[PDB]
Amino acid sequence: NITNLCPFHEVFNATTFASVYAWNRKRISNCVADYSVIYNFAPFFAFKCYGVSPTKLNDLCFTNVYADSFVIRGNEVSQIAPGQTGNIADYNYKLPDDFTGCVIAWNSNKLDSKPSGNYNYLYRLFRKSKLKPFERDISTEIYQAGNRPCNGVAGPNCYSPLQSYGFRPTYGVGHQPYRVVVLSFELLHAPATVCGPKKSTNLVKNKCVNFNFNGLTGTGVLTESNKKFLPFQQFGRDIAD
Amino acid sequence: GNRPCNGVAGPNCYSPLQSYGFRPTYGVGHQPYRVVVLSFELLHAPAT
Amino acid sequence: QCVNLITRTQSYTNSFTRGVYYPDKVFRSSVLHSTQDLFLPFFSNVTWFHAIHVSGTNFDNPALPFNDGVYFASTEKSNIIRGWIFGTTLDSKTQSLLIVNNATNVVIKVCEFQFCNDPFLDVYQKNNKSWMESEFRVYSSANNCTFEYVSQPFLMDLVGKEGNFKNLREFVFKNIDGYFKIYSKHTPINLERDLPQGFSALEPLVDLPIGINITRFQTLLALHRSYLGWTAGAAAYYVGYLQPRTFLLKYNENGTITDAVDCALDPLSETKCTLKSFTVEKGIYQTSNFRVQPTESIVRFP
Amino acid sequence: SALTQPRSVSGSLGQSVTISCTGISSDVGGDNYVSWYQQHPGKAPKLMIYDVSKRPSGVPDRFSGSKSGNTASLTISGLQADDEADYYCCSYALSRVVFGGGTMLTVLGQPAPSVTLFPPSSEELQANKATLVCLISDFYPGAVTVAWKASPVGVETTTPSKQSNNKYAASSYLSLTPEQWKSHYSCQVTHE
Amino acid sequence: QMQLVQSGAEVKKPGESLKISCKGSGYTFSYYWIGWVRQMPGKGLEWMGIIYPGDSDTRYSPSFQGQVTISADKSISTAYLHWSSLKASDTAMYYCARQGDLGDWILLGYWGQGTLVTVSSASTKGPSVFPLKSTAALGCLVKDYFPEPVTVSWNSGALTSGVHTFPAVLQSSGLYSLSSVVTVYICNVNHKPSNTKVDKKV
Structure with a gap:
């Protein structure tokens, strides 16, 4: 139980997320990812998963797990998904067909919206080509929609590729801002470093019970020993292997 | 969750049946696939 | 800064029984366990290096290869030799493991460093006794990194030293299936020649998954450069390459390896490993058959 | 995390002063979640x-700051009379706000304290009381010594005072009985 | 302009669970997060919690999850404070803050004027007024009062120029004392915590 838990804040509990075109990523590795704090965070609008069950996530092992946090409009929450299309799915954040993870989204009209207009959030709408899986494009150069050379400012034939969100609390459902957090899971030849909470139980001795110690399973009783195990040694084995 | 769920969905209880968003614009892997499983029980029994 | 100024001379020394470590963290007592793993052969020839600096700044030191593991040993006073380098290319082209040792909170970090010809550490500021790193001349440039690690200072000076006593430190590095293992143990020895007789097991110290490939390895020196611009210094250490061999380990009542047997040194040790006993009675015992290995390969085609 | 600030800082009119503050956290999406507040003595923070x-609207442009890792600092382009107040750094990156240990900004200026004496009235003598009041004001430094003459002479005094007039004041109340008051005093003031 | 004024000062014994209110105006008190900040005499600011008047969403500091609760009423644009199991060490100045359109939802854009809450067991002793070679100025003396805030006026407020009030001085008997002078007369002293008003002429 002395193992350090991975900080699940700064991604869900963060004040203001990164822009949709400039989404940031936190590398979660060499820790114990306690997903129990997620199920009681907020009334999420969507909690879909792909490849990994939402329940078995607290016990499966993964080499590296990434978390991407961004805020999009309420009517475009169905766009962030493997195989889907739209503005966000093509020019802001594209998921591959082999995406393995979960998608989390919840309402944020009381956080990322102001009466004067929360124009700090930006989203990409114009680009020469669609985004690749897990690709980022932070370029803010004026997209030349027309064949005429564009000037240093916006014009009739060229507009800024990044448009601002006019988030206002007076809007109804669908137009309110929604914070979206995407979780990505992967495994490779590198050994796994995150397996989730192990959820140990109380110790029972002098009884015929099943014991489990860091993966070693068996059946037998436990009694206080008088041995002199070394500080680095963990398992005890006799002559009979 | 541990809270008793009401007659509608909530933050700690959702519908167990999710719908397939089968769209023809999807690539390979998300398209619908018809599966027919033929189960045979062959043994020393009167066959039909 | 990157100036080749570290002179190194190499010699040879006999390693009688050093280089034995715990193959696993499983407790064993009053049992003779035989296992096949990477170890150092007994009575093998190892290279004895001598780092020498004459402070003539106002120098040859080639790199060392790495093959599945390298035995390291050092006994210089005041821990002159502290750091080590690991990696596959060691020229900022691929991720390379860098290990830095100091008085407190050692740092372990794998990155793409552009290692200099003679990478070491130098201290300054003697006028106000605030000893700190003067210049990071270990590398001239640094690319993006992937992983970092911090641990306690391992194998420091003697706690409660005695009058002019020497201490021998040993190190064994190994990387198997992506896990880099480090074994170390210090044993105080007399003022006579280094690597004395006896036996001493090396306990595991560091075990972290990095999954990177290692082809060569280097080390970091440390000199007490004081202004008056440069200060002389010396550092003697041992380097030994390991080979996969079969060894029989003996465990005492306390669970510590008290002796080991190299099953390919002499026929006596081979019979000991065959019988799994340190004491072989009078008799004749059949051992592994000898076979003449091929000298070369012949290829015949149409 | 907890924010720290130097408890005492000094400056001068027309010069500049810096107030450091560490403990700023970083989240995914931004790292500029640093704010500062100024609280006048005896008033609400602003x-x-x-x-x-x-910068906020209506705030003078003399205030500025900088960011360097987890350390933030508050810089003032020019000190004035109304700048003598407390300052508190704040961080709101983790959806929570925390304040430092507080500061106290002092400015130099021209220092002779005015000394006045007021004897008690007959209504206090009728109530078996006698309070002699020695008033000190018109002094810039925040230190003053109060004494009494019978041989040197309960008595209480408060050195600090409200800075609504850019100056400091001091008062002392020599509590004595009417019999001891009619049996005789003089106030003694020591200032820099 | 947008304003946010709190209630007046209060004084009760530990364990009475008093209530403080705050009235806002000049803006829609529905779309802005509002909170409170506590500051004890001598220490820095301590944030307790915030509340969004648009709904029942509330957030509080880990050190104030159950020690204080904040409520609001959108129909009258009034916020409220409530405590439980008060102690003698709970006497401190409280300040309010709102979100505004300056920064994010958590950033405190504006502030109020402050409300002093005194919690003690001194029974709230009432003050007394006594009058004071000047010719030249006249003054009056206020003694024997435990609560700190004391207001003094001259000639029912007719004289404002040349009038000054000095901070209170704590006597050895455990009671404060202040004095107010006027440049040259009836001195009027008002004490809100004890509801005592005494008029005296020099």
Whole structure:
């Protein structure tokens, strides 16, 4: 139980997320990812998963797990998904067909919206080509929609590729801002470093019970020993292997 | 969750049946696939 | 800064029984366990290096290869030799493991460093006794990194030293299936020649998954450069390459390896490993058959 | 995390002063969640610095700041009379706000304290009381010594005072009985 | 302009669970997060919690999850404070803060004027007024009062120029004392915590 838990804040509990075109990523590795704090965070609008069950996530092992946090409009929450299309799915954040993870989204009209207009959030709408899986494009150069050379400012034939969100609390459902957090899971030849909470139980001795110690399973009783195990040694084995 | 769920969905209880968003614009892997499983029980029994 | 100024001379020394470590963290007592793993052969020839600096700044030191593991040993006073380098290319082209040792909170970090010809550490500021790193001349440039690690200072000076006593430190590095293992143990020895007789097991110290490939390895020196611009210094250490061999380990009542047997040194040790006993009675015992290995390969085609 | 600030800082009119503050955290999406507040003595705090690259409306442009890792600092382009107040740094990156240990900004200036004496009235003598009041004011430094003459002479005094007039004041109340008051005093003041 | 004024000062014994209110105007008190900040005499600011008047969403500091609760009423644009199991060490100045359109939802854009809450067991002793070679100025003396805030006026407020009030001085008997002078007369002293008003002429 002395193992350090991975900080699940700064991604869900963060004040203001990164822009949709400039989404940031936190590398979660060499820790114990306690997903129990997620199920009681907020009334999420969507909690879909792909490849990994939402329940078995607290016990499966993964080499590296990434978390991407961004805020999009309420009517475009169905766009962030493997195989889907739209503005966000093509020019802001594209998921591959082999995406393995979960998608989390919840309402944020009381956080990322102001009466004067929360124009700090930006989203990409114009680009020469669609985004690749897990690709980022932070370029803010004026997209030349027309064949005429564009000037240093916006014009009739060229507009800024990044448009601002006019988030206002007076809007109804669908137009309110929604914070979206995407979780990505992967495994490779590198050994796994995150397996989730192990959820140990109380110790029972002098009884015929099943014991489990860091993966070693068996059946037998436990009694206080008088041995002199070394500080680095963990398992005890006799002559009979 | 541990809270008793009401007659509608909530933050700690959702519908167990999710719908397939089968769209023809999807690539390979998300398209619908018809599966027919033929189960045979062959043994020393009167066959039909 | 990157100036080749570290002179190194190499010699040879006999390693009688050093280089034995715990193959696993499983407790064993009053049992003779035989296992096949990477170890150092007994009575093998190892290279004895001598780092020498004459402070003539106002120098040859080639790199060392790495093959599945390298035995390291050092006994210089005041821990002159502290750091080590690991990696596959060691020229900022691929991720390379860098290990830095100091008085407190050692740092372990794998990155793409552009290692200099003679990478070491130098201290300054003697006028106000605030000893700190003067210049990071270990590398001239640094690319993006992937992983970092911090641990306690391992194998420091003697706690409660005695009058002019020497201490021998040993190190064994190994990387198997992506896990880099480090074994170390210090044993105080007399003022006579280094690597004395006896036996001493090396306990595991560091075990972290990095999954990177290692082809060569280097080390970091440390000199007490004081202004008056440069200060002389010396550092003697041992380097030994390991080979996969079969060894029989003996465990005492306390669970510590008290002796080991190299099953390919002499026929006596081979019979000991065959019988799994340190004491072989009078008799004749059949051992592994000898076979003449091929000298070369012949290829015949149409 | 907890924010720290130097408890005492000094300056001069027309010069500049810096107030350091560490403990700023970083989240995914931004790292400029640093704000500063100014609280006048005996009044409510006022927002002067939020989102360091920006400033609130109505706040004078003499306030500024900088960011260097987890350390933030508050810089003033010029000190004035109304700048003598407390300052508190704040961080709101983890959806929570925390304040430092507080500061106290002092400015130099021209220092002769005015000394006045007021004898008690007959209504206090009728109530078996006698309080002699020695009033000190018109002194700039925040230190003053109060004494009494019978041989040197309960008696209480408060050195600090409200800074609504850019100056400091001091008062002392020599509590004595009417019999001891009619049996005789003089106030003694020592200042820099 | 947008304003946010709190209630007046209060004084009760530990364990009475008093209530403080705050009235806002000049803006829609529905779309802006509002909170409170506590500051004890001598220490820095301590944030307790915030509340969004648009709904029942509330957030509080880990050190104030159950020690204080904040409520609001959108129909009258009034916020409220409530405590439980008060102690003698709970006497401190409280300040309010709102979100505004300056920064994010958590950033405190504006502030109020402050409300002093005194919690003690001194029974709230009432003050007394006594009058004071000047010719030249006249003054009056206020003694024997435990609560700190004391207001003094001259000639029912007719004289404002040349009038000054000095901070209170704590006597050895455990009671404060202040004095107010006027440049040259009836001195009027008002004490809100004890509801005592005494008129005296020099």
